[PDB]
């Protein structure tokens, strides 16, 4: 182990394409751009979703729906997150302190995802049917 005995893993560093350095290189004269077109040109090419002029798919098809502002402030909790908090009470504030839900999160739901072993008291949160059953089995409590 000297500064002239170390070496990278095989496959770590790969050879960097150098365009336009002669015939043997492979990427010879043209540099893998074929022969004179728009794409051949420096700066050449066409913007995203351009189809020669055809009405592009993102325009062909109709716009739909709207964005909900309450969805931005809802969140979804896991039973593994019911264990990740500290204590035995799961409020919004407690979850936030734990760092599980985001700060501007008015509402949260406990979903049956993962598993809860310790007894936990879910207070003031919506809980899905499977999650509620799981928590009860764990020996927990849910209250509004």
């Amino acid at each position: 182990m000297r500064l002239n005995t170390l070496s990278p893993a095989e496959g770590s560093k790969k050879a960097g394409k150098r365009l336009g350095r002669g015939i043997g290189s492979g990427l010879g004269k043209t540099g893998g751009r074929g022969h004179k077109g728009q794409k051949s040109r420096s700066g050449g090419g066409v913007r995203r979703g351009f189809e020669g002029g055809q009405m592009p798919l993102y325009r062909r098809l109709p716009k739909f729906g709207f964005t909900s502002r309450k969805a931005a402030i809802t969140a979804e909790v896991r039973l593994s997150d019911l264990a990740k908090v500290e204590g035995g009470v799961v409020d919004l504030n407690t979850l936030k302190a734990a760092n599980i839900i985001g700060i501007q999160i008015e509402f949260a739901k406990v979903i049956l995802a993962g598993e809860v072993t310790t007894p936990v008291t879910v207070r003031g949160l919506r809980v899905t049917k499977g999650a509620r059953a799981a928590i009860e089995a764990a020996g927990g409590k849910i209250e509004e």
Binding site: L3, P8, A9
Partner: protein, 201 residues
């Protein structure tokens, strides 16, 4: 893990994770390379055809003169024209994940112990701030190219070191993988080794 000491011939227990792990060469190499990249300064710049000092007028008319068609005197294919892809000052600093860095350090430390390049001692203080004294001590310890890692900061030791280019005295907080690899031997004080273990975990 257990390192016997030179001065007292007494053992010192350490973590197997820190001082007895495998040497992951690829990881170590990446970390050292990153260190070098970070150390570079990267201050340079050429002039693009934009920046080269001159007028932006057409040297001669597009057609007629029979000369090849020229547009600017600052062209990159002209003598005293711009550099085509002129450099700017750039930051060559690579990120290294904390865990990756720590692992690399662990591997290097382990390698040193295996290779018998890590020498542990109870204390490596010099009495005066005198290069002559430090040199004599090193000779007595048999050493020449060495990184003396100390726990607590020592003024006499640091000053004495200053003029020996083969010798380098560091605080245990300021160790770095390139330095460890570079220096022929590494002499850690007992406090320093303990501190390093605490740091690395």
């Amino acid at each position: 893990m257990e390192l016997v000491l030179k001065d007292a011939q007494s053992a010192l227990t350490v973590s197997e994770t820190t001082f007895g792990r495998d040497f992951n060469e690829a990881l170590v190499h990446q970390v050292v390379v990153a260190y070098a990249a970070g150390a570079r300064q990267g201050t340079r710049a050429q002039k693009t055809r934009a920046e080269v000092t001159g007028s932006g007028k057409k040297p001669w008319r597009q057609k007629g003169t029979g000369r090849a068609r020229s547009g600017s005197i600052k062209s990159p294919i002209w003598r005293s024209g711009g550099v085509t892809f002129a450099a700017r000052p750039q930051d060559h600093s690579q990120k290294v994940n904390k865990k990756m860095y720590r692992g690399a350090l662990k591997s290097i430390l382990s390698e040193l112990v295996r290779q018998d390049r890590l020498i542990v001692v109870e204390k490596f203080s010099v009495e005066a701030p005198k290069t002559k004294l430090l040199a004599q001590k090193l000779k007595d310890m048999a050493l020449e190219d060495v990184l003396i890692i100390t726990g607590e900061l020592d003024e006499n030791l640091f000053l004495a070191a200053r003029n020996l280019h083969k010798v380098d005295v560091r605080d245990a907080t300021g160790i770095d993988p390139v330095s460890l690899i570079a220096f022929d031997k590494v002499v850690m004080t007992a406090d320093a080794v303990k501190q390093v273990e605490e740091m690395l975990a």
